[PDB]
């Protein structure tokens, strides 16, 4: 069977869009990510999510935002969607100032830690590298 | 009685584990472009896994990197759907 999607609201869609990184990280700026963030805003507005866009967050602001949202009351929401646009490596997403572990972010939403989302689908969409391998393809 | 605390997550990764993810400096990341296009066309028709499987095909077949640096040129990408979900997901 299939998730109940007819709660009063579809749920939150949180978009963390990190374009500009501190130069101490040695990370290039991610030009074009603004087009992505706006594409995602319109797409999820059309599916009835309350979209909240965040821009250039440090790893501490990422952790803190994720904690605060996980303590909101989602009782009347059907789902939860989180979009992370940043640099990354395997298991890791970068705030503007350093890496933060993906499992640190998702753990706030575990079934035992976010009771008002237990049994509801939690979607994490992750635009970021996961290492340095190159796929040369085959014809 | 109870469910795993890890159940009911879905991680839609833009790229296979270990690999680079590609982004166009003007049009956005291959993966987000394709995800928004597929949602717009199919979110009132298809289940989420099947929308995401169409994202996989679009990225895999329509995109190839263009780089003035040969090391980064003519590369490919397959997104990576990771589902601990326990039911099908329909957006309408």
């Amino acid at each position: 069977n299939s998730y109940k999607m007819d709660y009063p609201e579809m749920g939150l869609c949180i978009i963390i869009n990190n374009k500009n990184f501190h130069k101490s990280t040695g990370m290039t700026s991610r030009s074009g990510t603004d087009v992505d963030a706006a594409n995602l805003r319109e797409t999820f507005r059309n599916l009835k999510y309350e979209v909240r866009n965040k821009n250039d967050l440090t790893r501490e602001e990422i952790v803190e935002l994720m904690r605060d949202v996980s303590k909101e009351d989602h009782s009347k929401r059907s789902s939860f969607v989180c979009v992370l646009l940043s640099h990354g490596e395997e298991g890791i997403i970068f705030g503007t100032n350093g890496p933060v572990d993906l499992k640190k972010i998702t753990n706030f939403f575990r079934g035992d830690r976010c009771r008002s989302l237990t049994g509801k689908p939690k979607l994490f969409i992750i635009q970021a590298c996961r290492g340095t391998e190159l796929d040369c393809g085959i014809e | 009685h109870k469910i795993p605390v890890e159940a009911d997550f879905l991680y839609a990764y833009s790229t296979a584990p270990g690999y680079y993810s590609w982004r166009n400096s003007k049009d956005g990341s291959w993966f987000i472009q394709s995800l928004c296009a597929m949602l717009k066309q199919y979110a009132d028709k298809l289940e989420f896994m099947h929308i995401l499987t169409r994202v996989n095909r679009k990225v895999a077949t329509e995109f190839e990197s263009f780089s003035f640096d040969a090391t980064f040129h003519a590369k490919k990408q397959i997104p990576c759907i990771v589902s601990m979900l326990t039911k099908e997901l329909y957006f309408y």
Binding site: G88 | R23, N24, F72
Partner: peptide
């Protein structure tokens, strides 16, 4: 141009 993330 294409660039990596």
């Amino acid at each position: 141009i294409t660039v990596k993330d």
